[PDB]
Amino acid sequence: GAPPIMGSSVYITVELAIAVLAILGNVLVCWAVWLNSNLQNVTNYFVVSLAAADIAVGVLAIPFAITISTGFCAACHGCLFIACFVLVLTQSSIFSLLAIAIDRYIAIRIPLRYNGLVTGTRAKGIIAICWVLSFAIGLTPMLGWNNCGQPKEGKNHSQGCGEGQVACLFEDVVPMNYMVYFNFFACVLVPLLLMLGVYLRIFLAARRQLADLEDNWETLNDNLKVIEKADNAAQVKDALTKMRAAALDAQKMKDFRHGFDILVGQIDDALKLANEGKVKEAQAAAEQLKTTRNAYIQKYLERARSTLQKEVHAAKSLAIIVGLFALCWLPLHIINCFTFFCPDCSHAPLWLMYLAIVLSHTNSVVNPFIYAYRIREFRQTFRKIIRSHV
């Protein structure tokens, strides 16, 4: 068995590399939101909270991880704090991700109500509440759900620890039932599944709304044909009644509203002539709709489509961040499940424990790269900061 300092040196070196990168990338994120008013919106207040948690990974959770890797002698409740602080950050991250998803669902479902419901002041309150809850959840073990009452007396004496002290090792102080049922199942997996559900609802709303835009467009175009080759005022009247319903429903800002007012007015003109039995006049009147379509209605359609496609692209980007969080944390959670549920299975080896821990920390590096690659407004602001300063 090789001197422990050799593997420990590799682990510590990698941890420090990750800490540096987590700090730099997430400071860049915060700086970009600070500088650019185009990035100052409610969604991004949660992005900044998430970035703050990742900065705290580099500044605090990584130094604490290095420390607990040594098994140093510590008062048991101080050892718990060192062990569990990262759980606070990871819970805050989960709350920020959940908020972003909900935020984007409100935005796609009730866009005319979004700015009145989802305000900066309300978002700051939610963020504050979520941090408090993250402290309560992550430090639950320090309220007495811990193994400090059942110390490993053999380890503790071999190591030379004093009174009230334990060899500070994660699995010796933090109960595995806590880690599996409370931390993993209740506080991580349930919220991740809820996020999956919210994102599926966002994509279903986008698809339905885009389908409706197309359907209304087709209705207009198809009924203009019904009118053109109609042979009586009744056939023209019936097409025009359906066009009016589709025009009024689509209507549900200046050039937009003027366009739809022209359209309804022109439909009403044709409806009047059709009710009077003036078939050719109604047909001539209905053809005038084509000017309004071409000048106004098509432009509205293309703009509505474009807004919705942008929301789908944006939701995919945010969903990727959720996926990478799951990728990075799941291995550690899964290992804990094997340790807990399979006492006849050999414990995962030390090298794998440390690989899983390092992977979990690497999550705090990745989000700035996702913003840079997938969100133009962040990318452009990052370039301006880097070019001007560093």
Ligand X SMILES: CC(C)CCC[C@@H](C)[C@H]1CC[C@H]2[C@@H]3CC=C4C[C@@H](O)CC[C@]4(C)[C@H]3CC[C@]12C
Ligand Y SMILES: CCCCCCCC/C=C\CCCCCCCC(=O)O
Ligand Z SMILES: CCCCCCCC/C=C\CCCCCCCC(=O)OC[C@H](O)CO
Ligand U SMILES: Nc1nc(NCCc2ccc(O)cc2)nc2nc(-c3ccco3)nn12
Q: Which has the closest alpha carbon to 131: 39, 32, 48, 67? A: 48
Please say whether the dihedral angle defined by the alpha carbons of residues 216, 218, 224 and 227, taken in this order, is positive or negative.
Answer: negative
Cβ-based nearer residue to ligand X, 341 or 369: 341
Q: Please state the closest distance from residue 22 (CB atom) to ligand OLB, in A.
A: 11
Cβ-based nearer residue to ligand X, 81 or 114: 81
| Joined tokens for residue 242 | 């359906």
Cβ-based nearer residue to ligand Y, 4 or 164: 4
* Of residues 39-78, those binding Na ion (CB under 5 A): 53-54
The DSSP code sequence of 110-145 is: -HHHHHHHS-HHHHHHHHHHHHHHHHHHHTGGGGT-
Q: Please state the closest distance from residue 209 (CB atom) to ligand Y, in A.
A: 14
> Quick one: angle between helices 42-56 and 350-374, nearest 10?
150
Q: Which residues bind to ligand Y, rule: CB under 6 A?
A: 4-5, 7-14, 16, 21, 24-25, 27-28, 30-31, 34, 55, 59, 63, 66-67, 69-70, 72, 77, 128-129, 131-133, 135-136, 139, 142, 193, 196-197, 200-201, 204, 320, 346, 348-352, 354-355, 358-359, 362, 365-366, 368-370, 373-374, 390
The single-letter DSSP state of residue 231 is -
How far does Cα 380 stand from its chain's mean position? 21
Q: From ligand Y, ligand Z, ligand X, none, which one binds at residue 28 (CB under 5 to 8 Å depending on kind)?
A: ligand Y
Is 110 a binding residue for ligand X by CB under 6 A? The answer is no
Pair 281, 240: CB distance under 8 Å: no
Q: How far is CA 331 from CA 15, 200, 326, 361, in A?
A: 17, 24, 9, 12
Q: From ligand OLB, ligand Z, ligand X, none, which one binds at residue 34 (CB under 5 to 8 Å depending on kind)?
A: ligand OLB
Q: Which of 64, 171, 269, 330 binds ligand U (CB under 6 A)?
A: 171
Cβ-based nearer residue to ligand Z, 136 or 327: 136
Distant-in-sequence, close-in-space partners of 314: CB < 8 Å, separation ≥ 6: 104, 375
Q: How far is CA 122 from CA 109, 135, 296, in A?
A: 19, 20, 38
Q: Which of 7, 78, 175, 191 binds ligand Z (CB under 6 A)?
A: 78
Is 56 a binding residue for ligand OLB by CB under 6 A? The answer is yes
Q: From ligand X, ligand Y, Na ion, none, which one binds at residue 323 (CB under 5 to 8 Å depending on kind)?
A: none
**Closest residue to Na ion, based on beta-carbon distance:** 93
Is 86 a binding residue for ligand OLB by CB under 6 A? The answer is no
Is 145 a binding residue for ligand OLB by CB under 6 A? The answer is no
Is 338 a binding residue for ligand X by CB under 6 A? The answer is yes
Virtual torsion, Cα 348, 58, 22, 128, nearest 10 deg = 110
Q: From ligand Z, ligand OLB, ligand U, none, which one binds at residue 171 (CB under 5 to 8 Å depending on kind)?
A: ligand U
Q: Which has the closest alpha carbon to 89: 139, 47, 54? A: 54
| Joined tokens for residue 51 | 């970035």
* Of residues 39-78, those binding ligand X (CB under 6 A): 74-75, 78
Please, what's the b/e burial string for 178-200 (b: 16 or more CB within 10 A of its CB; e: otherwise)? bbbebbbeebbeebbeebeebbe
Is 189 a binding residue for ligand Z by CB under 6 A? The answer is yes
Is 178 a binding residue for ligand U by CB under 6 A? The answer is no
Residues 130, 353, 349: CA angle, nearest 5 degrees: 155
Residues 362, 356, 18: CA angle, nearest 5 degrees: 25
User: What binding mask, one character per residue, do residues 25-54 give for ligand OLB by CB under 6 A, x or -?
Assistant: -----x--xx-----x-------x---x--
Instruction: List interacting residues with Na ion (CB under 5 A).
Output: 53-54, 93
| Residues near ligand OLB, by CB under 6 A | 30, 33-34, 40, 48, 52, 55-56, 59
